[PDB]
Symmetry: C5
Subunit: 93 residues, 5 copies
């Protein structure tokens, strides 16, 4: 199933814009370092995937086979906690 940060699936007609769906993960409460320095996946991959799984599960719940126009937001939330929040429009194609 296609998940894209773009407005449409080039080649495919959208049958229905079903709903806007979201997912969120709250992560735990001269050196510039990459997110994958010293590890195979990025430190935020677990958070990001939890957030995207929730969004995908909801979309699937709503009869979607695709999710377009997705955005990722990051906010430091509670006592230091990182939230990753993902939003997108569930569609039938």
């Amino acid at each position: 199933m296609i998940v894209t940060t773009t407005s449409g699936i080039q080649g495919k007609e959208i049958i229905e814009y079903i709903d806007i769906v979201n997912g969120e993960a709250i992560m735990g409460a001269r050196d510039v370092v990459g997110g994958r320095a010293g590890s195979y996946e990025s430190k935020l991959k677990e958070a990001r995937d939890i957030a995207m799984d929730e969004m995908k599960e909801l979309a699937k719940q709503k009869g979607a086979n695709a999710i377009v126009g997705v955005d990722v937001d990051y906010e430091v939330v509670r006592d230091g906690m990182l939230m990753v929040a993902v939003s997108g429009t569930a569609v039938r194609i």
Copy 2:
């Protein structure tokens, strides 16, 4: 009513761009532990987790946006964006914006 975070509705022409519409809601304060107060604080309101309350606040901000759009004679809202910001004393704000359109 069609609501999308994309810049258009494939299949339909936009007959008129009516206006830009917004909705916000701030979460309720912490009560104790992972318990958080109702976003909408009058008889009925439900306490719960940070995530269930965040989702509630995002649902009210959304519904406020849709109610304004409908007041303006819109049948669709395109180019919807969500924004999150921690404001006064740790409460989370959810703000939603989009363009109300006739299709």
Copy 3:
């Protein structure tokens, strides 16, 4: 005059991109408990004041757009950020165009 968050306008040709235009406003301070100071301005809730500031920001942007001889703003975006010790700045951005 058309103002829109979409990247374009349907059915109408842009004959000229003029300039990116912006507006901003900072929310007034907290008075007491849930009451916030106007940005004969009225005190209100956080959300009421927030809406007021966003309205001022949007008007300021349109104002700048019209004076540059535009009749439309496209690709509009709203940004929020807490500023000088607890106080929500709104900032609106857009592309002023001739249609």
Copy 4:
């Protein structure tokens, strides 16, 4: 040089997408906010021009309080040829 927040120019095909370009201005220590935004935008345009671009599309502005009293404004965009 046409600069726009839209993702596209009208009556003008993009023939090269050169790079994403960025500008930033740092303040503190509303009118100075405008100055900052201008410095960020001018810095991004300069880079775009030096890269061989004649337009910048999909422009976005971000605002961040890096410390306290310091506000950063960052603009990002795609440098293109039309």
Copy 5:
């Protein structure tokens, strides 16, 4: 590789949408402090330096996103967004996202 903040490649149809890809970089507090140059007014990121003081963080974020995309068999990344956020004790994070595609 074409990297673009736009939602498509004018002139080129997208034949496959592979994955959303992300890259990030994190700046130490010690370093963020060495960009409080604003001891006077407003200064550009390129005042007194060749490349912007944040360019290295962005380039590391962008490199990781691209390396990932490339490994997934993509030859372009579209709908790119850059995000900034202050986390833990004053470190600055720059995060980038986009859709890895095949054209």
